[PDB]
Design a protein around this ligand. Structure first.
Ligand SMILES: *[C@@H]1O[C@H](CO)[C@@H](O)[C@H](O)[C@H]1NC(C)=O
Ligand SMILES: Cc1[nH]c(C(F)(F)F)cc1C(=O)O
Length: 353
């Protein structure tokens, strides 16, 4: 099990100002460190953050967090459940900033909520250095859904943080699970009122303003003032990243379909869904380390049965091990680019049920 540690710097807070924190299980015989960013959507104005505080409070506050957490999937220490990194140091960073891990603004006389996700990551990494991270050889920043986008927004800043702190030998890498979204047109044109039905583009634009959200420097320099929302979209931010990033993405992510207003499938919907899979496949063509099965599902890497799905006969744990090997061109029998080509949910027979 992983043990909670509330951040020693209590000015780094969840939305309601309670301390943010992390769950840790040390593996002293290991120089590998897995820092996992939890997911869970976001909120982008006082009204919808107030509603989320009323019935999703754990995503906004540490006041009710349990003392321990079981590591599952890629965070499991059992080899049968986690053939990839069962022996690593395991860190689970609860998501309590509702800002897709982008914020850097404190709660004040003028701000009802704090949005500090990016400062949370930075501070966790700092306090971990004194608990063994300083000796690490690889730090894999991983994350699912909003945490998957968080990886893309933060992996390079973590690299740069550790460099400026004097730890050049720690290799920072990213594993973005289910955080590779398309800013496409919705199937039906609902209006952005809440957070689920809202279109992705308008969601992020309002959010950044409200959170004081920050994005990777090189991506920021491309899109420039006002257009930083662009960097929340994997296919636009990924090419600007310097750290190695493995991308895991269902071709038909349920959260993508939700924001696209997709729920007897007639021609119009069949075409829309097939176009979505092809567009997603297109954006992954030049991502050399990726695992993108043709399934309708949400998230994967901390589910107990994440070992089950395969693309072209290769499991995600195997693909991640081949990726490790590639970073010591293509390896014999150890493929790293695994993107399904069939065009409909569950044409891959290993899709979860
Ligand atoms: C604690 O966090 C605050 C807010 O980000 C920051 O200003 C300060 O530098 C941190 N303290 C230390 C000792 O790093
Ligand atoms: C469900 C979801 N949609 C988006 C969007 F708008 F960028 F596509 C981000 C998330 C997330 O939780 O990270």
């Amino acid at each position: 099990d992983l043990r909670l540690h509330l951040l020693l710097n209590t000015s780094v807070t969840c939305n309601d100002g309670s301390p943010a924190g992390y769950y840790l299980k040390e593996s002293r015989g290991s120089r590998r460190w897995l820092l996992f960013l939890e997911g869970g959507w976001y909120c982008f104005n006082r009204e919808n953050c107030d509603s989320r505080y009323d019935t999703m409070r754990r995503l906004m506050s540490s006041r009710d967090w349990p003392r321990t957490r079981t590591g599952t999937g890629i965070l499991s220490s059992q080899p049968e459940e986690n053939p990839y990194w069962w022996n690593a140091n395991m860190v689970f960073i609860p998501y309590c900033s509702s800002d897709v891990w982008s914020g850097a603004s404190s709660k004040s006389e003028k701000n009802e909520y704090a949005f500090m996700g990016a400062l949370i990551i930075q501070e966790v990494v700092r306090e971990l250095l004194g608990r063994g991270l300083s000796g690490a050889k690889v730090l894999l920043l991983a994350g699912s859904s909003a945490g998957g986008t968080g990886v893309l927004l933060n992996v390079d800043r973590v690299a740069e943080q550790l460099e400026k702190l004097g730890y050049p030998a720690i290799q920072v890498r990213g594993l973005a699970d289910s955080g590779w979204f398309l800013d496409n047109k919705q199937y039906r044109h609902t209006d952005c009122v809440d957070t689920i039905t809202c279109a992705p583009t308008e969601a992020i634009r309002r959010g950044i303003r409200y959170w004081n959200g920050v994005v990777p420097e090189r991506c920021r320099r491309q899109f420039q003032e006002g257009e930083e929302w662009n960097c929340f979209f994997g296919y636009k931010v990924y090419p600007t990243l310097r750290s190695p990033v493995f991308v895991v993405q269902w071709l038909f992510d349920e959260a993508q379909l939700t924001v696209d207003n997709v729920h007897p499938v007639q021609e119009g919907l069949r075409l829309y869904i097939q176009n979505l899979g092809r567009e997603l496949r297109h954006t992954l063509k030049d991502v050399p380390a990726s695992f993108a099965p043709a399934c309708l599902s949400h998230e994967i890497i901390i589910r107990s049965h994440w070992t089950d799905v395969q693309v072209k006969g290769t499991s995600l744990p195997r693909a991640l091990h081949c990726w490790d090997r590639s970073l010591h061109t293509p390896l014999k029998g150890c493929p790293v680019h695994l993107v399904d080509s069939c065009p409909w949910p569950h044409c891959n027979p290993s899709c979860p049920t």
